[PDB]
Design a protein around this ligand. Sequence first.
Ligand SMILES: [Cl-]
Ligand code: NA
Ligand code: NA
Ligand code: NA
Ligand code: NA
Ligand code: NA
Ligand code: NA
Lengths: 419, 419
Amino acid sequence: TYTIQLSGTSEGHYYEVYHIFSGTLDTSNTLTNIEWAPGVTEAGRTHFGNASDKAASLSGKQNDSAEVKAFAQELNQYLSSAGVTTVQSQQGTTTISGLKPGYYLIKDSRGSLDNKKGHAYTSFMLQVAKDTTVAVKADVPTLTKQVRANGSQNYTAATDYRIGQNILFQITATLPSNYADFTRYEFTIKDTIPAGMTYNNDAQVYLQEGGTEKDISTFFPISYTGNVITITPGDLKYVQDVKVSSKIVIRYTARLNDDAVMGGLGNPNIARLTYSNDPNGFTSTTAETPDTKANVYTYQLKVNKVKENQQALAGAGFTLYKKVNNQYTEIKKFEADSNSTFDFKGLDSGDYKLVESTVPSGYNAMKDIEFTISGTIDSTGDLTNLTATSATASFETDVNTGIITLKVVNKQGALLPNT
Amino acid sequence: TYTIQLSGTSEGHYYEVYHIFSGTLDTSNTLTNIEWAPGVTEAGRTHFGNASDKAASLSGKQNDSAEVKAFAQELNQYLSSAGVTTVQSQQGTTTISGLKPGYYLIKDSRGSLDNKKGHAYTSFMLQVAKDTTVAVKADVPTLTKQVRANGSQNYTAATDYRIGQNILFQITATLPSNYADFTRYEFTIKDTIPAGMTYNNDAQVYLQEGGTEKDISTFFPISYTGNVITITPGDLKYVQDVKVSSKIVIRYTARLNDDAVMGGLGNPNIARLTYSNDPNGFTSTTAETPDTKANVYTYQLKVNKVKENQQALAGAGFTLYKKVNNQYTEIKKFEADSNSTFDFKGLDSGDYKLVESTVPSGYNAMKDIEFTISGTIDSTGDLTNLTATSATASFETDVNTGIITLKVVNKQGALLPNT
Ligand SMILES: [Cl-]
Ligand code: NA
Ligand code: NA
Ligand code: NA
Ligand code: NA
Ligand code: NA
Ligand code: NA
């Protein structure tokens, strides 16, 4: 008995091995005394005619020959569980022991990958039973979503922006190594925008070959409903320029809006790819890729205006400036009234100046506060830390609310005695 | 030498005591051998004539008579600091020592009260120097502002409401004990509405004579510009029904809006009254009362949807109900998509139910959470504490941000084996 090692497998699959021909494998390594084995039905035997004559017409044909592919495809409709072995797939290499000599058809068990994500059916594989290693004829496309980092031109899992700033997003689809074995290729990217973000209706689709992009947008009508971007050409084979080494790249912009989440779990957009997962014949099963997720955080500065007894002081106004290329630019002003709490929603990492642009009557002007907001965003895309620092002042921060608190204590002017 | 005690005083004043007549006070309470003292100028002495004969025309006249009033008024243009004693006012009773016998005019020092709030100039007082107590002829109006409490129907310095709920406010003006001593009485209430509150343009003005109210709105044209309600009749004497014992009452509603401050210093409104502060002749000076403040706080529930590894779970939706009349009523619903953070803005103290009205695919429904929000607002009107409790769940709260956090951990369903 013989042992096929099936390399490049993942967990998740039940691989079925059908005994097509029995025979004796001689000192020569040809197969002799060939008969139909229990893995083919009587109907199939009758259809294909004499077993040894069929083996003869296949003898010395190439491994990827049209003859072997037609046999494997045409066999499938005549298979029997009378001569089936079934194996559970290991991560890396799947070992199939105890094979009597002869010729086996290997396939994924039908339906065995429905509803499961990131998997694909193998092209039906005809293999002679030797102690051999062969690569499984199965691949899956992949989907990566990233956000262009704050002023870095670099794509990342997550970053921080300010509300109203346009943000560039990128989704990259790779194609499976057996792309050519499909006659039709269903391709649908759905990208869910969070309530905290507004899409700019500007998605474009690019074919990326080695280092060169080509706008293929005209093939992909794009719809936006329910905060869901759908991108699909119906059949990706409509795009004839597409090779197996091609990337499909989607780019669009979105911007944080007033409903943005502060700190915490941020404002995530989640994409998945629905793809043709069965290269065998006239089929229209699909799987989805596992989710791919990008994230944009934003923070809030809460300024509290009080006097030395810590109760509220009305009548202050504040202007906040951000350093944009060493040029403090005004981003938010509050005019003065009864309010003592100033909530600057939608700040990112950067250098800020707070100016008390209106002083309550009877009180000294606060000195300007130059401060720095630093969100820690790891490669996962978790906001793990939020800090605000100033030479001149002291902040509270809570990463989970995204709130930076500054309590501004107002000192009374002097009521000076007169000799 | 004699000591007048001047009762009903506050700190802040410099009372000037002008020696008008010198003479001898006998065992009997009569003044004899009357001469002009140094407190009167030679121009006055000429105008009023013989001192003893002027004293004689005033002899026996009533304490509140027209003749004494007119003398005190016409004296004022002829005063000299050659015969002036000046005394700083104590809280309650101001002692004025070392008075040589005779007749004194007592007044607030000219301009003495112009930068100070909550004070009023006394009627010129003519007084015979005895060892006696006389009440100062000065009072001030008061202005009190309060808010009708959450479902309590009585008024208080501060309470909590939900965003969009109409809130009843009340401003009460008392008039000074010497209201009738004014010929004209400027009366202007300014009420500053915070950014986070919206005025319903429904202020009405009521006269209160004990426990009976009368709509006097028609006399008070009201304006609202800059989030400031201005209520003024120009002259309160135009409202002839208004007596010294009357209360003027302003009532209006406002509601919290989307810009509401959460927890912390809350959403205060500040009112002050501008009033005629000098009963002495043809004058148009005013003082403002000290600021009076009411406050409405509101809170925010933040629900984080996660799975057992504490990473965000997309695709949940939540409905929040408040118990209004032993009747859970829907106040806010979020639909499902990529968001994992549910910010329920604008909640008050009360009984709530959080229902996971949409369950992420492959996770068990959260069981409903009945919970209680309780903001502690003390007699001052400080939000000192904020708590959320449930038999079924645990919350985080921060009184400063007004944020109540619930982390909802989703458990996966069972992927059941099939024989
Ligand atoms: Cl007073
Ligand atoms: Na496979
Ligand atoms: Na595929
Ligand atoms: Na006269
Ligand atoms: Na208010
Ligand atoms: Na108000
Ligand atoms: Na007054």
